[PDB]
């Protein structure tokens, strides 16, 4: 499971006729970096079968 | 469950072929991001 917890916001700023840049607005919420969890039990079983092969 | 957690940084500018061509700016995504993936394989050396 992979999550980016930061609640970012998109700011559309017009930089010419038609062109529009999507800037990152101020953060809403926590100051946490994205991460991924993997069940240690299942990963230990899988790693065991890996080292067997 | 005791699931291991891995830290991930994020890039919006990537160059997998800047020399062949051009770079890409991944637009920012509003809100929190969460995807569930099957990890089926590995690549080792």
């Amino acid at each position, epitope marked *: 499971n992979c*999550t980016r*917890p930061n*609640n970012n916001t998109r700011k559309s700023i017009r930089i010419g006729p038609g062109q529009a840049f999507y800037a990152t607005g101020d*953060i*809403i*919420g*926590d*100051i*946490r970096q994205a991460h991924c969890n993997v069940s240690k039990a299942t990963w230990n079983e899988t790693l065991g079968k890996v080292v067997k092969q | 469950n005791d699931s291991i957690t891995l830290p991930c940084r994020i890039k919006q500018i990537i160059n997998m072929w800047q020399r062949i061509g051009q770079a890409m700016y991944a637009p920012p995504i509003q809100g*929190v*991001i*969460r995807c569930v993936s099957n990890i089926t394989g590995l690549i080792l050396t």
Partner: antibody
Framework: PQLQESGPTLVEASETLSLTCAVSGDSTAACNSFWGWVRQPPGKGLEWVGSLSHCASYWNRGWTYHNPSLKSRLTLALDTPKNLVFLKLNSVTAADTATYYC?????????????????????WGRGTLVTV | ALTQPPSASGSPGQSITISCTGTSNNFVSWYQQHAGKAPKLVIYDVNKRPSGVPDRFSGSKSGNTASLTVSGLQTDDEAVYYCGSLVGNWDVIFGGGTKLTV
């Protein structure tokens, strides 16, 4: 920013007490503050009732915090476009007779860790007297 | 829980100090409520004042005891002062209230 309470000032025993706060000058959708209530019995101290906010995270559609004792008998509600707060108290007793204040909670609401932390009440209301 | 003295009267001009015991965190705040009226935030984040609140009011903390200090009491300062803090996971508690009389 002005909070105007409205609702029945006189409710009969064993019935459902309903009160509504009307916000003016700020948006209830705004994630900068939490919205809730604080009751002051005629003389006693301030007791926290509860507060909520629709600004959620990836696993929920919002946050709602209740004071442990009143949780079973209370219901909190927010109308975001009309900037209105709702409060419903079931099975009211003479212990619930109080001056109810509409409260805006400041704190680590805009940048929190693990969970939002509403702490100080920056904006209060005029409050209404509810007699059971 | 949060505890406060029942009263803490003082003559105008004197420097006065009120205390609040039972704080486990820095989510301490102070509100002022006149008789028959509504409370007003006067202190947040232990020591911060909202814009427009006079600078005679200051907040400090020693150990588990927070303190509010007023230098130069005025006749319009008479009111009931309440303290508030965050406890447990997300719960909020207040003190009993202190009646400051001039």
């Amino acid at each position: 920013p002005q909070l105007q309470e409205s609702g029945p000032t006189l409710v009969e025993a064993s019935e459902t007490l309903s009160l509504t706060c009307a916000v003016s000058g700020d948006s209830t959708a705004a994630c900068n503050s939490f919205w809730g209530w604080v009751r002051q019995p005629p003389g006693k101290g301030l007791e926290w009732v509860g507060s909520l906010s629709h600004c959620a995270s990836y696993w929920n559609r919002g946050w709602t915090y209740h004071n442990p004792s009143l949780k079973s008998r209370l219901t909190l509600a927010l109308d975001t476009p009309k900037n209105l707060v709702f409060l419903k108290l079931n099975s009211v007793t003479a212990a619930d007779t109080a001056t109810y204040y509409c409260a805006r909670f400041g704190g680590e609401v805009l940048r929190y860790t693990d969970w939002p932390k509403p702490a100080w009440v920056d904006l209060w209301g005029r409050g209404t007297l509810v007699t059971v | 829980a949060l505890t406060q003295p029942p009263s803490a009267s003082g003559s105008p001009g004197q420097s006065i100090t009120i205390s609040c015991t039972g704080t486990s965190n820095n989510f301490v705040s102070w509100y002022q409520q006149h008789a028959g009226k509504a409370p007003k935030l006067v202190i947040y984040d232990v020591n911060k004042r909202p814009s427009g609140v006079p600078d005679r009011f200051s907040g400090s903390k020693s150990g588990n005891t927070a303190s509010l200090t007023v230098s130069g009491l005025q006749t319009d300062d008479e009111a009931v002062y309440y303290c508030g803090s965050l406890v447990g996971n997300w719960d909020v508690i207040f003190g009993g209230g202190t009646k400051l009389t001039v």
